[PDB]
Write a protein that binds this ligand. Sequence first.
Ligand SMILES: CCCCCCCCCCCCO[C@@H]1O[C@H](CO)[C@@H](O[C@H]2O[C@H](CO)[C@@H](O)[C@H](O)[C@H]2O)[C@H](O)[C@H]1O
Lengths: 95, 189
Amino acid sequence: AEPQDGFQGTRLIPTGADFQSPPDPFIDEGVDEDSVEGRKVRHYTVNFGPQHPAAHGVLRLILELNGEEIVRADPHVGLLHRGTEKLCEYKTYMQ
Amino acid sequence: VFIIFFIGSVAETNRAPFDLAEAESELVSGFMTEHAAVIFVFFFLAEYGSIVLMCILTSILFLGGYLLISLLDIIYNNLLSWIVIGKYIIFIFPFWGPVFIDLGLYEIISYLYNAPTVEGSFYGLSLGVKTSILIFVFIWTRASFPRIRFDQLMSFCWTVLLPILFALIVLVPCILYSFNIFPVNISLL
Ligand SMILES: CCCCCCCCCCCCO[C@@H]1O[C@H](CO)[C@@H](O[C@H]2O[C@H](CO)[C@@H](O)[C@H](O)[C@H]2O)[C@H](O)[C@H]1O
């Protein structure tokens, strides 16, 4: 009886991590010490954009770099979100 | 060796298609900081003057320098009917008896050819025509190719070009010894 049964938290929503299943062990394809292997490396972030061409006008993608290579790429969009899908509800179809 | 030098001379000037390293600065500037080559014409006159200078030196070394291929040698070989009357007949199939004016033209033309101003002029128009042709080939190169990544230009220099050059450093003096063609290193010429 949502939302009433959810007031006391008597039910938990079955997340995808509940239905995770171990891979089959048989046909499955592919620590701390004085060595420098255990050593960690710092990464630095880089703010890419806006580039000169018109199409990529509002791209603010933040990259994490290990040296030269990209570790993780996080695009921040919304810089040209103008609310089209809402304004369309207050207009006729032709409008 | 000339082609390697010209390609090396574009990469040395930081010119496109070898400019991707300095190109990527404008793409990561961000929303807080900016460049410094802004109001300065210095690093632009330093850049254009290094391109012109890499064109003159490229001409000094591989093209003639200021050497014009002189046609006055060709006319000597072809012409054989020297005439003291000023006719200047030529022993050629399209030849005839010219009417060049001894009093008006030949006396004047001969003097102007030996002038210190005229001969210097042609020596510099030759070097200028040759530098300009190479200035064209730099501009044509920038308009013809995309950019090369920094690792790829580094591979070009270190694993293609320099190996070939060191191979030619062995071979060239070996041939100059084999054909008795080592020049004298005293002041001649
Ligand atoms: C091997 C024999 C060589 C004989 C000739 C040697 C000439 C040396 C002249 C050096 C003069 C400065 O050299 C020149 O400097 C300018 C400014 O820093 C650089 O130019 C730099 O700034 C300009 C903007 O102002 C950019 O467009 C350019 O992409 C960038 O690299 C050139 O890349 C460099 O070639």
